[PDB]
Design a binder for this molecule. Structure first.
Ligand SMILES: NC(=O)c1ccc[n+]([C@@H]2O[C@H](COP(=O)([O-])OP(=O)(O)OC[C@H]3O[C@@H](n4cnc5c(N)ncnc54)[C@H](O)[C@@H]3O)[C@@H](O)[C@H]2O)c1
Ligand SMILES: [K+]
Lengths: 273, 123, 26, 309
RNA sequence: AAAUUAGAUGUAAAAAAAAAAUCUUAUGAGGGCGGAUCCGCUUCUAAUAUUUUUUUGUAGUUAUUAUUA
RNA sequence: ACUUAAUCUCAGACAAGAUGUAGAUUUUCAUACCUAGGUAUGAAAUGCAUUUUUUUUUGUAUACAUCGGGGGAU
């Protein structure tokens, strides 16, 4: 009267994307196209409402405003909303002004203090630039270290583990005392360690994998829960399960590591990025 | 009074009499905008269909798993659907500590910080 | 005869926000 | 194929990309200069009317989407990082967190009439007026389940100010209207008092406040500024009260006058306002939710702390 | 206790086709019969309404699952 | 019924889950083991209590079905 299926409970631990997706070539051109229509329909900018006359801020604003040719905005190039040539608001194909690289470059060049405390323009050589933002692709991205969490910051990374070999998610049999939600926590701690700031979403499983029995050999009904990591790293030392290695993989890399049937069952849980 | 006059000037510029007038396009300029508008609204459709496709696919994965769970018996001497009836509970889901504020506070950013990820975090 | 009002919006800029973490968004 | 024969023979969409040599020779600025004259105006000179005089009037008004329209507003300028965040990570967590499995052939639930009718053998019940809403005086909206077709999201935000003392010092209303302007990027509409209280020196039907409503992307940007740059700076801040909620998915709370000037748009030019004139605001966050617990579950996904009180 | 603002119902929106019957109408067939459009009886067709009625059909599209090549 | 005067009753029900208790020591299941079976270990199954409408208890069905003041015990 032995049970036919062996109920297991896994955990699909994921690191959400930490960066916004790259804007398509059309999304960039569209924003810029609408920023110049706003120039023609918004009220003018009154510097007297933010800067008071004859101050370190006013003088600094006037100098850089002349380099922009009067345009108070820094990310729309040179466009006069009023005048004979107002119609020429559209930009020709193959332009650099609409890109996001040129936008950040201009906004940073406008943050450096150009007027000393005494009101005199700082020499062109004595002007200290501003600290630029960090690059989107970190060192791990260039090296390709799959055991790192700061890799592919614009994609979701899934925790996959090897067992003495087949790659899979942290799994384990469900005892009679614990449910799926409180069994997935004990297994993750006994497999990847306790130095990960993880959050098991809830009690509902997001995917399942069923291995039919062999009329016999007991079948397995694996139920996966969604896990979200916020800090830390997986630690496979002193693990109770026969785990050897681990690696954080993307959605496109999972299908190259996991089996075809094992992947076809968890693919539905995947997200856009 | 001087400062209030500045504030009033800010409004005097926003009056309907001062704000710029409605745009005036030709044909080729209007048709150029008609396509940019026709392609943007279609782009949103492609993003709306994709976004709603993933939500439906992720949802169907839950239905399938829970449907299987409903008809399971175990583990051991536990009636059918026990794990199912225990998984459909909403204990603390609608409370104050439901979602950890460390995960919800971290939003997407154009560029990462000086330390993208903290691997040295200890319990 | 329903009057068609117009939107009265002030001038707006694009700003780079650098959090304490060093991360930047616009 | 005959079906493909019915499509337009000459398609602009199926034309090749513009030539680089043509791009080099296309100079809109040289045409106006080389012309040395003004091109004749086109005979099409339709301009949107200033008034809507009916659906059958000879001259009709175009939709707001028309760029030449009077109510046209330039489209999006960027993607609010909190909308991409919610739609990228938190859309599925709320759907997975709050999920009830319906069996495959579950019969569709039939809604019962909320304005009951009298049914019985008494001849009076026939033509009796429908009963009143049971419980509350007004029917509350019924909660919808968080589905993959119904994800609670932020819809609009209303920032309102009430300055009673402005009836004596008219400048308190000018400053309040400007602070609410830079804070939200729109022109607030002045409000008036509706009651008469002599103890408080309140007179009815006199301008005593201002209110703005930000919709779409503007409302997602404002939330980020509030959550990540304003609220974390309020001294000894505990969190939004857990009692907030009108029973329909809208969250309301208020800021102090010293916390309104923490807004980056107000601290930059804080010296341009007269002293002790920056007011406190009433922020009302309207969501697509249909419950108090759904809204509090939605805001927690965006990083709002809630405290018990 | 008493100031302002925000809220406070639900459903539907691809498309139907067809048979008979219960009435009611018609400046419909210039219907037929008595005394073209006047009148009380009158069949047929059409339209509105009513049956829980006899049903037939309920696709296509996107996705999931199962079989099949 | 709506409105008017006065009076009376109710303000909660079920399913699941959880929490314990004496058991019988049979079956299933998980681990420490031994050598695929037994050996144990616990857990469940089981009977009666027990918690439950905003609670550190969710769901269904319902008008979320109730709030302060005052007198007591912790
Ligand atoms: N909008 C429609 O025409 C439409 C069509 C079918 C269904 N629906 C239903 O309505 C819901 C919402 O409609 P939606 O998904 O089309 O809204 P949306 O997210 O595409 O638009 C939201 C707002 O942000 C702007 N926006 C959209 N994409 C942007 C981007 N990439 N960058 C910057 N700004 C952007 C839009 O102009 C709009 O003002 C849908 O989920 C669906 O349920 C809507
Ligand atoms: K879209």
């Amino acid at each position: 009267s032995s049970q036919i299926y062996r109920i297991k409970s896994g955990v699909i631990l994921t690191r959400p994307p930490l960066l916004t997706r790259d804007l398509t070539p059309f999304e960039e051109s569209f924003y810029f196209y609408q920023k110049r229509l706003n120039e023609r329909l918004t009220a003018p900018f009154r510097k007297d409402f933010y800067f008071k006359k004859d101050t370190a801020a006013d003088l600094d604003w006037r100098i850089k405003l002349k380099e922009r040719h009067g345009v108070p905005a820094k990310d729309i190039g040179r466009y006069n909303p009023r005048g004979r040539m107002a119609w020429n608001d559209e930009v020709l194909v193959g332009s650099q002004t609409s890109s996001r690289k040129h936008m950040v470059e201009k906004l940073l060049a406008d943050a450096e203090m150009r007027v000393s405390e005494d009101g005199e323009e700082i020499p062109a050589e004595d002007r200290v630039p501003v600290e630029k933002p960090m690059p989107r692709r970190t060192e791990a991205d260039e090296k390709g270290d799959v055991k790192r969490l700061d890799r592919a910051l614009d994609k979701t990374l899934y925790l996959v583990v090897k067992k003495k070999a087949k790659w899979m998610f942290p799994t384990g049999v469900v005892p009679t005392d614990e449910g799926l939600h409180e069994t997935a926590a004990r297994i993750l701690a006994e497999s990847a360690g306790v130095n990960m700031n993880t959050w098991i979403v809830g009690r509902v499983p997001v995917a399942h994998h069923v291995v039919r029995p062999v009329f016999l050999k007991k079948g397995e009904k694996i139920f996966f829960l969604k896990g979200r990591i916020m800090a830390g790293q997986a630690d496979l030392t002193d693990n109770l399960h026969d785990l050897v290695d681990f690696k954080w993989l993307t959605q496109e890399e999972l299908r190259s590591t996991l089996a075809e049937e094992y992947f076809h069952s968890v693919k539905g849980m995947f997200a856009e990025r | 009074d001087p400062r209030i006059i500045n504030i009033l000037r800010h409004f005097a510029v926003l009056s309907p009499k001062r704000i710029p007038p409605p745009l005036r396009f030709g044909r080729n300029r209007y048709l150029r905008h008609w396509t940019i508008h026709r392609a943007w609204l279609l782009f949103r459709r492609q993003q709306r269909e994709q976004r709603e496709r993933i939500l439906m696919q992720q949802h169907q994965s839950m239905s399938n798993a829970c449907e299987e769970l409903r008809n399971t018996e175990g583990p051991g001497t536990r009636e059918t659907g026990y794990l199912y009836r225990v998984a459909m509970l909403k204990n603390g889901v609608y409370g104050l500590k439901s979602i950890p504020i460390e995960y919800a506070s971290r939003a997407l950013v154009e560029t990462p910080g000086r330390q993208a990820w903290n691997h040295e975090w200890k319990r | 005869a329903t009057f068609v009002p117009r939107h009265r919006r002030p001038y707006q800029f694009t700003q780079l926000v650098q959090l304490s973490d060093g991360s930047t968004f616009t | 194929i005959p079906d493909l024969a019915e499509l337009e023979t000459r398609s602009a969409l199926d034309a090749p990309i513009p030539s680089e040599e043509d791009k080099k020779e296309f100079r809109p600025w040289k045409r106006a200069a080389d012309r040395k004259a003004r091109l004749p105006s086109s005979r099409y000179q339709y301009h949107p009317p200033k008034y809507n005089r009916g659906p059958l009037h000879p001259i009709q008004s175009p939709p707001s989407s028309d760029p030449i329209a009077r109510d046209f507003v330039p489209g999006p300028f960027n993607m609010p990082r909190l909308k991409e965040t919610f739609r990228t990570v938190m859309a599925s967590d709320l759907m997975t967190l709050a999920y009830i499995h319906t069996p495959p052939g579950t019969p569709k639930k039939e809604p019962t009439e909320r304005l009951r009718a009298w049914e019985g053998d008494s001849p009076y019940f026939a033509n009796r007026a429908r009963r009143a809403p049971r419980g509350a005086p007004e029917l509350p909206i019924r909660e919808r389940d968080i589905s993959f077709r119904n994800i609670p999201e932020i819809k609009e935000i209303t920032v309102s100010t009430f300055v009673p003392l402005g009836l004596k010092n008219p400048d308190l209303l000018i400053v309040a209207r400007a602070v609410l302007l830079a804070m939200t990027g729109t022109m607030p509409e002045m409000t008036r008092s509706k009651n008469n209280v002599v103890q408080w020196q309140l007179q009815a039907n006199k301008p005593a406040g201002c209110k703005t409503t930000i919709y779409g992307n503007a409302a997602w940007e404002f939330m980020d500024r509030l959550i990540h740059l304003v609220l974390p700076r309020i001294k000894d801040w505990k969190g939004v009260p857990a009692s907030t909620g009108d029973g329909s998915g809208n969250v309301q709370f208020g800021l102090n006058p010293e916390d309104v000037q923490l807004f980056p748009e107000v601290e930059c030019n804080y010296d341009m306002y007269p002293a002790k004139m920056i007011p406190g605001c009433h922020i009302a966050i309207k969501t697509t939710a249909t419950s108090d617990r759904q809204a509090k579950l939605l805001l927690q996904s965006l990083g709002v702390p809630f405290y018990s009180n």
